[PDB]
Ligand binder design. Sequence first.
Ligand SMILES: [Zn+2]
Ligand SMILES: [Zn+2]
Length: 850
Amino acid sequence: LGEKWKSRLNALGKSEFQIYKKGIQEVDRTLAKEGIKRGETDHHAVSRGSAKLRWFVERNMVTPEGKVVDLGCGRGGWSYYCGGLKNVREVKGLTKGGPGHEEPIPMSTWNLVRLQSGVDVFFTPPEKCDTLLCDIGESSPNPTVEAGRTLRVLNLVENWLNNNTQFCIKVLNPYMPSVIEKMEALQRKYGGALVRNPLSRNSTHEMYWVSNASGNIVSSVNMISRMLINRFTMRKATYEPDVDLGSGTRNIGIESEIPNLDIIGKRIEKIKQEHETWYDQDHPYKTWAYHGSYETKGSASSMVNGVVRLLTKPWDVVPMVTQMAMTDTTPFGQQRVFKEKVDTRTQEPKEGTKKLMKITAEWLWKELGKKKTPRMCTREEFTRKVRSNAAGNKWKSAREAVEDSRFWELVDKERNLHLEGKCETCVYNMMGKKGSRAIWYMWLGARFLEFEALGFLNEDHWFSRENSLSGVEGEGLHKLGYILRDVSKKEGGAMYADDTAGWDTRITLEDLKNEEMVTNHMEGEHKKLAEAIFKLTYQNKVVRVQRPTPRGTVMDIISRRDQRGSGQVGTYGLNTFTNMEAQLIRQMEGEGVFKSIQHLTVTEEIAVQNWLARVGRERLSRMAISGDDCVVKPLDDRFASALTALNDMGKVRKDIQQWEPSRGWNDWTQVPFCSHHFHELIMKDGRVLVVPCRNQDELIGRARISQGAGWSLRETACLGKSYAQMWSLMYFHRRDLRLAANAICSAVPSHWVPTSRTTWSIAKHEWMTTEDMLTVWNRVWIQENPWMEDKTPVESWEEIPYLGKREDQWCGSLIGLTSRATWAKNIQTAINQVRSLIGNEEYTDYMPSM
RNA sequence: UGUUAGUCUACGUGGACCGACAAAGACAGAUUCUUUGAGGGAGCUAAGCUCAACGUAGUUCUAACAG
Ligand SMILES: [Zn+2]
Ligand SMILES: [Zn+2]
């Protein structure tokens, strides 16, 4: 049956073979090449078997625990993937080695992994193991030779397997009579079946002999044979996300967090009372202790931005914009992200680092407390802060809960209980977002007390540059660019920009003990509620998360005593404060103060305190920090190599191996702050300006994403208009971008007031106004620059310049190609066609077409 | 051992510009820039060099792979 398939498989041309191997679900390998070349020894792997193992493991087709015997590691994919699992006691690897064979490259993804390279698996006498993995195999343009290889491997491992032994063998010759007969003999005694992994590539008929099943392989063989017969004359190229693998050495000390019961007993009783009609043994958690589950009824739905899409004809064929705009729906993505990043444990710091963080937070709160004071907020402000598109366990909306009138009856008892530092309902709910970071919601009744406790941060502006000197609040995009323009004038060296990976999951237990110091200045019932919320909730998080197994979609509860401790709204300021602290400690390591981070003494503590109290404002002025992002201008060139105190805290940086040298910029035009780089432009009026910029394909694609739940066309047109307005008021230095903005504004009717969402990191969102764009441009980009003394109004758009061709093509463009020429020539046709497609109202001209 | 895109090491073919000449991109319109030929081949020739456009033969390497 399969001999014709094998004969025609080697009868294909080599070029067509390479084209045909990659339409299936192939995981991305673009970053794997960088990881090999740049020398990253952790994070995303390179072996194609790792994706197959990930697919098989999460559905419990295999149960890898106890003793592990591997038969060939390739580059180390199977060995290192299972080296970090919770219950894998020992990892033993024997690579065939020698010339002509695939050889593993040492990595640091391994404490219990022992590799003896250069030894065939046939040199080893028959030994029994808990779970065995088989990968080694060579395909040749003769089926008999690979059949003999399969026969010899099966004959060797025949004495190795038993009923108790788990196994994952990748069968390379599953369609020959003798191997099939032997497999049938084995499956009638031990169990396991031949299944094709959809993540396996179509290089050949590679099957997997699974152990968590006992069905007959006949149907699977027939189905896969038919599918691969009809795949030759098929009537695609998609990438799946690369599975995170973490880094470091596994330890048995911090494994799992003990769930304290005297705080969550009533909460779990309340959770159980919801169904009572409620455990499971298919949970993959190793750091989240399960306590209950209940049967319940995919990922975030992506909506295309049609208005932007129609007018971006030159970018209709670029794959990046399309893939960022097209629908991406999978029924496993949420739990995929959950297991790859949130389920991972965090290495805890040591006494020296935690003490340094403790004293740094004390100094910082000493400094900011002398110019501000927390205030007891009021009820009316809570509804006033209902901005953004989320404006929504009965009900789910904020507006409805106010008029439900049960809200006060619920919150009264909680307010009374929070007086004495006791609580009963402070639960969370997390779901949705491909992103790789966690988003936290909160109960709206709990949201009310969270607001009444810590809502002063978003209004009193503790983190404004007046009291922060490094924050983003109180400083617009133009003002941030101006500050970056003055940082260069300030004496110093290189400008360093970094983006730490997994910031939310890397926040340790000690860090949450720094925010409690805000209770120092509070008083009365506000202080009592602050202490109660800081103790009862900020150190004990209950999360209800889904698991859609073939047995059903079950929501289960899990308790963790680490990571972020707030919702989606207050997280910004707290994260910014922690990031200022982290930048301060990293600079302290760079300059050189402490000679040992394992241990400390009073003298170093008081010296650090004096240094902080002396030059804290000066050091804060030099750094520009927004959320998890931070750009730094230190006073030394040795700032790059000081990473020991940085990774002692437990921060992991992506795009590079953790212990490799840092990356910085001596050019301030390409320093990414707030995920954007600033260009300087010279205009005819004798004054200088600054503008944001990035990969224009990224900007267009972000303009091509529509968010939310439920949608229409008017809001899409408003999105297009708002994107165009923001482009004109911020990115006016570009040709393609400004052309698109003036054509979308010329297409969407201007009688519709723009009130929509652009991003999440937007002060002074000027691009939601129906005013004349020239007027607002005049007011924001001439009047609002205190360095300018000659205010020269412009009554036409011929004055506003662009950048030269070199920088335009450097930051990504289409000038110098016939596509840009066609788009510029056909601006009339595109404008008219989108005007006809959207609607016809009285338009407002903002630029001449030519 | 190949498939597929590049590349350090060699030298030669061949060069650093002239405009109210012509044509095509950059639509902020400049001393406009860039690009190709017709006429000068900058009295008039040319290796060496700073670079690399072109080529022939690597005992030069990696890269989805391949065997
Ligand atoms: Zn509570
Ligand atoms: Zn740019």
